[PDB]
Write a protein that binds this DNA or RNA. Structure first.
Ligand SMILES: [Mg+2]
Ligand SMILES: [Mg+2]
Ligand SMILES: [Mg+2]
Ligand SMILES: [Mg+2]
Ligand SMILES: [Mg+2]
Ligand SMILES: [Mg+2]
Ligand SMILES: [Mg+2]
Ligand SMILES: [Mg+2]
Ligand SMILES: [Mg+2]
Ligand SMILES: [Mg+2]
Ligand SMILES: [Mg+2]
Ligand SMILES: [Mg+2]
Ligand SMILES: [Mg+2]
Ligand SMILES: [Mg+2]
Ligand SMILES: [Mg+2]
Ligand SMILES: [Mg+2]
Ligand SMILES: [Mg+2]
Ligand SMILES: [Mg+2]
Ligand SMILES: [Mg+2]
Ligand SMILES: [Mg+2]
Ligand SMILES: [Mg+2]
Ligand SMILES: [Mg+2]
Lengths: 203, 52, 90, 38, 210
RNA sequence: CGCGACCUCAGAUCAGACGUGGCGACCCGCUGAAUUUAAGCAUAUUAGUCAGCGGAGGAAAAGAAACUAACCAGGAUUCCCUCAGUAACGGCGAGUGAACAGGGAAGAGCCCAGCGCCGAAUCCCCGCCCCGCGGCGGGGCGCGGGAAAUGUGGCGUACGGA
RNA sequence: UAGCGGCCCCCGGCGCGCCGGGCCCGGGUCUUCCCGGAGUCGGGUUGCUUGGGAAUGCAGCCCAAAGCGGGUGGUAAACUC
């Protein structure tokens, strides 16, 4: 099946041919606007692996992200305080740029509902992404029981709570000795549980 | 391109610096080793085609 | 730009006169329209009351599987698909 | 300013719709019917 | 400011602890809400066993505890395969399952098999449709006697075998424990070097001799 | 040139739909201080805390192993007791500080893509007719209209399977 | 107020008898075939954070893989089971 061929091809990203195609895309998108709807998927494989289904009610939004770190938002240097917290320029934001992209699209298209994302290309200044969105009221989705879990009102704005593939990684959850701080629901609830006194009746 | 260049080193018989070069880019010894043996075998295929 | 040969190859295209003959052939072995489908199944219902011929085969995944199966003698392709990665290897 | 919060909240005003929603919930949001006349 | 004598100690009352205190005046009511939900469940699923499905015998890990026995997750796939039960049906009559478990020891696998056999014997199975009893079903007396089993079904009791008063041979008198111990620890420790010095001495002897 | 397929992109008070704010005790994701302690202070501590911003539910989040172990082995998650003020971190000063095994509450497991078989066997909407209609559905009929080979449905998913 | 005390309305709850549709699936045996998710793992490097100390986790830049393969086995490394 061709898709398996497609897969190892897109893994051959260093090859001269793939390099050429991505190079042309990156030029093309740089000249287009920073956020717009693609009519069909750029990567059919990535979409099928992730969940995309050639049916009504699926949309794909291309978005351009500016690259680099996070300098502290402050007037001059003048971070008033101690020389420990003087640090400011070479600081790095905890979440990726990929989740940032997802966040911006989801907030713009509020009615829609964010499934997942994949990479397409990059310059120095910019990365590029393809965000898969869904309409939760078209009957194609409502009646199909595999998908009607998204229609439920809990999953509003998933990207904002970090339940997307990117959001799960920032939470630091995992099994084993490498992921002890999250035991419990999250990093926050761990701290709560360890730093509470249980004053009993009987003591 | 790096694989091509490491091949040209295997042609000029500098197997240690070629290994060094791969280890420098890719990192570990095992991955570099298995990649090197593959590149030697394809050069063997060139030896076969020149033979027959 | 300096275009690599594996893409340049699509510029070599089939001539007008031979292509018309190809379409002349497929016109004989066209797949059935929807309305004829209801009427053939209706006649088949009559068959129920009382072998498919060869046809074209569509879809890349179909084509390639039955290429591995070495059944197809002739493979036609379109030159102007928007992401080329689909067909390149074929 | 928690005191500023309490100066301006839901309990304060009418809540002319919201107080009666509590009442409708009390009877499971019954609708369109009536009882039988005498 | 320490006067003459005490335990030097580091108490952790620097964080804002008086905020996050969990008081336990709930307790008695919580006990009741559990008790009520348990009685209502047993009232719902009336004749099925209250505790749930039977769970298998398992050896404990860690040198400390490996004498004990517990309940596990569920019966293994080999125990089922060998007793001759489709796993999904086994699922349906209230038998605990977990597939992930391996089975290295023969005594465990085999004893778990025995345990299922007694269960499979005792089980009083009802028809799907009452009108037509089937082959794999229970008799009318059995349906009459069916009733809830209170408590954990087939309780795990750790038995100990009694050894009668033996006569001691003088050989048994002779055997030397302590020496055998310190000796065996030493051979295990030094095992690798005996081979290293042996390879070096044989390799040097062969090059020097030949 | 003119006409016709597609592709890409606009405008419509187009026909039908949805978002937009509030509350914010409890929850989730970010950003993120100093008073103060050390008899001083600058690393540490205070603290991933107050304050700022966004998003939710009657609960949320979590979750069915890229696991623990290294014993004759255990077997999703969540919560309680104990392991423990321990192993470890630290101007080795001040102080900080877990987990696994064990006994308990509750106890339920599953699904795609792919790889492959099947005349696309799939779907949505209009129109017409019958029933029912205060959680807008069941059925029958249209050379009625589109979606879909850049892959729709059935079987089936690592416990192997056809 | 007590009482397995009474009466009257609405809503639900388990049962029974019948209509109009859909679903036509299994248990074993032997023979032949089939089987996996990349800018992701991993490495160097910087800064924060964590009890994690030749770097526990997270992120940014740069490099950039494999298929009897890969990760883990709490002191870096090579060989090895
Ligand atoms: Mg942070
Ligand atoms: Mg004293
Ligand atoms: Mg209970
Ligand atoms: Mg309108
Ligand atoms: Mg609100
Ligand atoms: Mg001080
Ligand atoms: Mg002072
Ligand atoms: Mg001072
Ligand atoms: Mg800190
Ligand atoms: Mg701390
Ligand atoms: Mg609500
Ligand atoms: Mg949830
Ligand atoms: Mg989760
Ligand atoms: Mg999981
Ligand atoms: Mg453990
Ligand atoms: Mg499934
Ligand atoms: Mg399915
Ligand atoms: Mg599929
Ligand atoms: Mg009374
Ligand atoms: Mg720190
Ligand atoms: Mg990362
Ligand atoms: Mg260690």
């Amino acid at each position: 099946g061709a898709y398996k061929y497609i897969q190892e091809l897109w893994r051959k990203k260093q090859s001269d041919v793939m390099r050429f195609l991505l190079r042309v895309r990156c030029w093309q998108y740089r000249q287009l606007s920073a956020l717009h709807r693609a009519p069909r998927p750029t990567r059919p494989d990535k979409a099928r692996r992730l969940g995309y289904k050639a049916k009504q009610g699926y949309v794909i939004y291309r978005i351009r992200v500016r690259r680099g770190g996070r300098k502290r938002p402050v007037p001059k240097g003048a971070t008033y305080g101690k020389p420990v917290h003087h640090g400011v320029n070479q600081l790095k934001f905890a979440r990726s740029l990929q989740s940032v992209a997802e966040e911006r699209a989801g907030r713009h298209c509020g009615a829609l509902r964010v499934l997942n994302s994949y990479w397409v290309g990059e310059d120095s200044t910019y990365k590029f992404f393809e965000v898969i969105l869904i309409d939760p009221f078209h009957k194609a989705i409502r009646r199909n029981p595999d998908t009607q879990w998204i229609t439920k009102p809990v999953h509003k704005h998933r990207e904002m709570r970090g339940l997307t593939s990117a959001g799960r990684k920032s939470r630091g959850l995992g099994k084993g000795h490498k992921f002890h701080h999250t035991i419990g629901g999250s990093r926050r609830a761990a701290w709560r549980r360890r730093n509470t006194l249980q004053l009993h009746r009987y003591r | 391109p790096y694989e091509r260049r490491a091949m040209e080193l295997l042609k000029v018989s500098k197997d240690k610096r070629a290994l060094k070069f791969i280890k420098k880019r890719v990192g570990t010894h095992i991955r570099a080793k298995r990649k090197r043996e593959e590149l030697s075998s394809v050069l063997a295929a060139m030896r076969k085609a020149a033979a027959k | 730009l300096k275009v690599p040969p594996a893409i340049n190859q699509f510029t070599q295209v089939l001539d007008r006169q031979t292509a018309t003959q190809l379409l002349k052939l497929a016109h004989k072995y066209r797949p059935e329209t929807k309305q004829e489908k209801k009427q053939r199944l209706l006649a088949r219902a009559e068959k129920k009351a009382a072998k498919r011929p060869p046809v074209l085969r569509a879809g890349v995944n179909t084509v390639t599987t039955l290429v591995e199966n070495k059944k197809a003698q002739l493979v036609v392709i379109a030159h102007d698909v928007d992401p080329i990665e689909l067909v390149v290897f074929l | 300013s928690a005191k500023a919060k309490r100066r301006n909240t839901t309990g304060t005003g009418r809540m002319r719709h919201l107080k009666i929603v509590y009442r409708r919930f009390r009877h499971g949001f019954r609708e369109g019917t009536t009882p039988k006349p005498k | 400011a320490p006067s003459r004598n005490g335990m030097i100690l580091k108490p952790h009352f620097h964080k804002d602890w008086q905020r996050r205190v969990a008081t336990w005046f709930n307790q008695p009511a919580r006990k009741i809400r559990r008790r009520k939900a348990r009685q209502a469940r047993a009232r719902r699923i009336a004749p099925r066993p209250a505790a749930g499905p039977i769970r298998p015998i398992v050896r404990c890990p860690t040198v400390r505890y490996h004498t004990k026995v517990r309940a596990g997750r569920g019966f293994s796939l080999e125990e089922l395969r060998v007793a001759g039960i489709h796993k999904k049906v086994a699922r349906t009559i209230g038998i605990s399952v977990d597939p992930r478990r391996r089975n290295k020891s023969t005594e465990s696998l085999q004893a778990n098999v025995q345990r299922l056999k007694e269960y499979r014997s005792k089980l009083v199975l009802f028809p799907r449709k009452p009108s037509a009893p089937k082959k794999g079903d229970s008799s009318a007396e059995e349906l009459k006697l069916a009733t809830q089993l209170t408590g954990p079904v087939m309780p795990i009791r750790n038995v100990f075998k009694k050894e009668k008063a033996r006569v001691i041979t003088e050989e048994e008198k002779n055997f030397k424990a302590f020496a055998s111990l310190r000796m065996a620890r030493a051979n295990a420790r030094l095992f690798g070097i005996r081979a290293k010095r042996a390879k070096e001495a044989a390799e040097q002897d062969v090059e020097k001799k030949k």
